[PDB]
Amino acid sequence: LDFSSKPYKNLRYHSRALRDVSYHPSLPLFCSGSDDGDVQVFHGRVYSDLLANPLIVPLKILRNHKVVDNVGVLSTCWHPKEAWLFSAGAGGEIRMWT
């Protein structure tokens, strides 16, 4: 919001439509789940200093999630305490990524 109306950065790795994005409330991490069945886990470090732009780097590409009817990962949630991810699939499977 302090950079510009245009997005600060653009990221286009997902092979399918990006469904859900969630940022961890405390830890400087966030996740993105799409219908491709793969979840991208990135680290975003935010610095209150004006000179220090946010440091956004990839951290992991979670895989091995079932895709049904062109729909894979539907929603992702961050644990309130640590870097634990709840991933919901189209097959009724909930994956706890510790």
């Binding site: 919001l1 302090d2 950079f3 510009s4 004006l50 000179l51 732009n53």
Partner: protein
């Protein structure tokens, strides 16, 4: 003259070579106006708290020939 409300882009446009001179205005409302001269456009930024204003004084590059009130 584009009124600029994002401090970070005011910082990056200052570091970009197009910037030539910068002026700081202190009005009666205890607001600090950062005016940056570019090639075609004069970009201004209004901040209301002094500590952020002072922090952005020292965040500006030393090469920029900043000036005080006119």
């Amino acid at each position: 003259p584009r009124q600029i409300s994002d401090i970070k882009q005011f910082l990056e446009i200052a570091r970009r070579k197009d910037a030539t001179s910068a002026r700081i205005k202190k009005n009666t409302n205890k607001d600090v106006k950062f005016k940056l001269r570019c090639s075609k456009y004069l970009y201004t930024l209004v901040v209301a708290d002094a500590k952020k204003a002072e922090k952005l004084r020292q965040s500006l590059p030393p090469d920029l020939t900043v000036t005080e009130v006119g």
